[PDB]
Structure 1
Amino acid sequence: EHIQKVAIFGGTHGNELTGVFLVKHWLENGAEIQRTGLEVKPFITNPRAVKKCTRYIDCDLNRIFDLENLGKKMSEDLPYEVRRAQEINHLFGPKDSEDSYDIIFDLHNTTSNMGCTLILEDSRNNFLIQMFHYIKTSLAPLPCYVYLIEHPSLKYATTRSIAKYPVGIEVGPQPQGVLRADILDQMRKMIKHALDFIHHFNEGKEFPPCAIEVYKIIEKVDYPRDENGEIAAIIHPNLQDQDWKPLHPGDPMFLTLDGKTIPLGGDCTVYPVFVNEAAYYEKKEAFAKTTKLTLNAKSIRC
């Protein structure tokens, strides 16, 4: 299998402007994202949310590419993002069809101090592991992590799950509604390597069995809450900005205004991720706990 149809999504969330800015540039002069023998389409997924420069209009677009939403009768009555979701599935899918696109990169941003991050939706997918191994290794010494999202009741119905091979791209720290240049540079480098991988894959290159480190999600921790549901403590200074780095039972986790430290607890070291994400205030979450495990890929061919 050669890859034929590659797309780059920007503006899934309208106030994550790195994607929006790159995608809008690339819809004018696309040279950067083409490769000899490869044809890739840039696309703004949520134009309404990008105009208002807001996360979403009626509901989060990045949580609805599932059966419950993609298979309901089209009606101007529907929440905007649902109408949009079908519009996108019909363009780049349909999801779970042989006709759907081969790879979609879906570009995101985070207020968390994560750096260049790749999101894996299938720990068994050998083509994705090889891609991600390629992107990590290439980027060095620029740090780059892989966030693993299966399992088994907690998976999201994402925009890029339309593809046979879904690829999430997150780069942080960045405030929402801010275009930073370091971040934009890092994101354009990640894509550069991703698109060069696909190009090498097509040209017939073999990749030897490889091994990458991933961080598998396990549990989302919410903030200590009040007898109302108001946040009662904040992310401890010592945990702030320490995404990916080991957090041990003893370690400070939250801090109250009165000054008291609330520690981790539990049996083992976890690796905090999305520490203090703007978007997860609403959704009740301070960060996600992840375990550090190794994924091995078998060799791959043209």
Structure 2
Amino acid sequence: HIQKVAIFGGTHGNELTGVFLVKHWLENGAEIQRTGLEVKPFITNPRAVKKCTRYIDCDLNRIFDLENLGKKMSEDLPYEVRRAQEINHLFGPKDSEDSYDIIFDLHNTTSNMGCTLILEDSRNNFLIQMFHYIKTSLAPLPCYVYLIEHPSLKYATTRSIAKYPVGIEVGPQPQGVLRADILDQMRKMIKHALDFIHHFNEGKEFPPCAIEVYKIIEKVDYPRDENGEIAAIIHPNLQDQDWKPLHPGDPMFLTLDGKTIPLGGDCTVYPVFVNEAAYYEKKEAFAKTTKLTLNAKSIRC
């Protein structure tokens, strides 16, 4: 039974949809309340929101792990690290029973991804049902689910503090810009998420279901010079083509001279986060994903 729910906004300070929504909702929460359900709106990274920059010292969305959550509180710590524990203390602690039940983390991307749900555990029947509800409701407005196990490549996110972590991501939008079409998409996603919780609390029954998802396999960096400067850019045929299948023969990168670098390897992949501004720094031109089906068992209150 689901009691404590939060919506995080502005983990990254230059992603404004969330910042704008959560700031609005801290003033008039009507839209996100449901009878017998209190949801807390909350700005995760206030200083970065003030400078309208991604982060101050290091990326807040990668540090909710033992290495950082266990360091002794001290004003010598990088801002985001002090902020991480502050948040862990209020909405967690992580890996505990006192922690919130569901945290929604709002994000924007420069990639042409549309409405996307980020799923942190393949085995979780509740999350699979929530996502199935959300995809199906949004239709025909397209909506995809990105999955992260790995083993190596899973990052410790702000919303991992909760029992049920949910990433809501909507793009394309450049950083530091508010677009209405995006804002409308995001608040629709939230509407359906909150409605699912209400229909779970009100004892509704959900039959077994299947959702399609895209599993992370590998990240690909840009071809680079000897100094490490970018030597090729995303091919026009790959630009804006997130989710769509990329075959072993197909063009990936293009150089200034105008030579095409093709995919290679054994098989067909599904590119994700194609040409995200924030990942130039992280050396990820895009993510390779495999399409695979996830099955859920039925669920009751």
State the 1:153 CA deviation.
Answer: 1.5
State the 1:209 CA deviation.
Answer: 0.2
- Show CA shifts across 1:39-84 (max 9, x none): 0000000000000000000000000000000011100110000000
CA distance in 2, matches of 1:77, 1:210: 49
Q: Secondary structure at the match of 1:141?
A: coil
- Show CA shifts across 1:69-121 (max 9, x none): 00111001100000000000000000011000000000000000000000000
The residue aligned with 1:23 is 22
Query: RMSD of the TM alignment (CA)?
Result: 0.4
CA distance in 1, matches of 2:34, 2:295: 28
The reply on whether 1:36 has 2:23 as its aligned counterpart is no
Aligned ranges for residues 103-118 of structure 1 at < 5 Å?
A: 103-118=102-117
CA distance in 2, matches of 1:112, 1:173: 5
CA distance in 1, matches of 2:209, 2:191: 21
State the 1:6 CA deviation.
Answer: 0.3
CA distance in 2, matches of 1:259, 1:300: 54
State the 1:160 CA deviation.
Answer: 0.2
CA distance in 1, matches of 2:106, 2:151: 24
CA distance in 1, matches of 2:173, 2:80: 24
- Show CA shifts across 1:219-245 (max 9, x none): 000000001100000000000000000
Using structure 1 for the length normalisation, give the TM-score. 0.99
Q: How many equivalent residue pairs? A: 301
The residue aligned with 2:213 is 214
- Show CA shifts across 1:168-220 (max 9, x none): 01000000000000000000000000000000001000100000000000000
State the 1:154 CA deviation.
Answer: 1.1
Q: Secondary structure at the match of 2:243?
A: coil
The residue aligned with 2:203 is 204
Q: Secondary structure at the match of 2:67?
A: helix
Identity value in percent? 100
| Structure 1 ranges of 4+ moved more than 6 A | none
CA distance in 2, matches of 1:81, 1:95: 17
CA distance in 2, matches of 1:159, 1:287: 22
State the 1:287 CA deviation.
Answer: 0.2
State the 1:285 CA deviation.
Answer: 1.0
Query: Which structure 1 segments of 5+ residues have no match?
Result: none
- Show CA shifts across 1:260-300 (max 9, x none): 00000001110000000000000111000000000000000
State the 1:126 CA deviation.
Answer: 0.2
The reply on whether 1:187 has 2:199 as its aligned counterpart is no
Moved more, 150-159 or 181-190: 150-159
Query: Which structure 2 segments of 5+ residues have no match?
Result: none
CA distance in 2, matches of 1:108, 1:102: 20
Using structure 2 for the length normalisation, give the TM-score. 1.00
